[PDB]
Amino acid sequence: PPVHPFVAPLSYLLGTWRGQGEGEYPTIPSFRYGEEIRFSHSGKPVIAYTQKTWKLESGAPLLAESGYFRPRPDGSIEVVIACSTGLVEVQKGTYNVDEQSIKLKSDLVGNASKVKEISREFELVDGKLSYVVRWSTTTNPLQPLLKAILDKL
Amino acid sequence: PPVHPFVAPLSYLLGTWRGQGEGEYPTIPSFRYGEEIRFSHSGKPVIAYTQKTWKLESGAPLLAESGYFRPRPDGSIEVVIACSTGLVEVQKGTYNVDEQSIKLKSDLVGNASKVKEISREFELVDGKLSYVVRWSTTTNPLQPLLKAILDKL
């Protein structure tokens, strides 16, 4: 199917990406992980997102998440994500075509009593997908949790 | 990877399923659809769920959803689902090993102002996967929306 006009501005996402990231947070010593993301579509105004992470040494599975990105021609976007840990997120924000960036903040975090807000920001940098995920909790203001850079395969 | 002990009681789900369903609701004339579901795992206490639907005549894509099922040895289960329409659900309930059934009710429906609660009930019937999805809205009490039966491939 052809790319829907609402998806076309984010067509640079479509494909598979692999790289690595790092986590850290006040309660949590730093950790590293491998990551793969696939963005795909079926001609609708939606991009399917699927992700997985693993241990760098061994390739042992860690976590997974999946969901859907819904861009609109005014530059707005909403994203819904379910995670293997049992969290869900409703993310809303904007994409910028000149910067090839997407900036999202949660409207809702479900099933995760301690995390309050989550933000996710993506940017294409020299053709690589970078992101930052920030979390807040009741006692920790919004701050980085995860950062990763992935190459397009 | 081997099946995690918490997933083993739901091992009958693992695989791909294809069949058809029907929708209907007070505001909505009846419609039919084809459906495919895949349940998979990576050795963790989680089953990945992915689903899609299509028009019966043509195979044209309709909707998609995906998420994660987290069974526990006491018979409890939580399920998180993101949908291509932009909804998210946190489902909680129980599974019954003798009946090969799973019965879920939403704790949370996100990003869908009019739908209030969603229930999902699965049952293996002569080896086929059947379900019923019920919805409530502010003015319509919980009642069937979708029902489908799928054969294991």
Swiss-Prot record, chains A, B:
Gene3D superfamilies: 2.40.128.20. Pfam families: THAP4_heme-bd. Heme b binds at T27, L145. InterPro entries: Calycin, Nitrobindin, THAP4-like_heme-bd. Its cofactor is heme b. Its EC number is 5.99.-.-. Keywords: Cytoplasm, Heme, Iron, Isomerase, Metal-binding. It is found in: Cytoplasm. It catalyses: peroxynitrite = nitrate. One of its GO terms (molecular function) is metal ion binding. Its main location: cytoplasm. The keyword Ion transport does not apply. One of its GO terms (cellular component) is cytosol. The keyword Iron applies. It comes from the Eukaryota. Pathway: Nitrogen metabolism. A motif (GXWXGXG) lies at residues 15-21. Binds 1 heme b group per subunit, that coordinates a highly solvent-exposed Fe(III) atom. Forms a 10-stranded antiparallel beta-barrel structure able to accommodate a hydrophobic ligand in its interior. In fact, this fold hosts the heme group, which is located in a wide surface cleft. Homodimer. Heme-binding protein able to scavenge peroxynitrite and to protect free L-tyrosine against peroxynitrite-mediated nitration, by acting as a peroxynitrite isomerase that converts peroxynitrite to nitrate. Therefore, this protein likely plays a role in peroxynitrite sensing and in the detoxification of reactive nitrogen and oxygen species (RNS and ROS, respectively). Is able to bind nitric oxide (NO) in vitro, but may act as a sensor of peroxynitrite levels in vivo. Belongs to the nitrobindin family. This is Peroxynitrite isomerase Rv2717c. The lineage of its organism: Eukaryota, Viridiplantae, Streptophyta, Embryophyta, Tracheophyta.
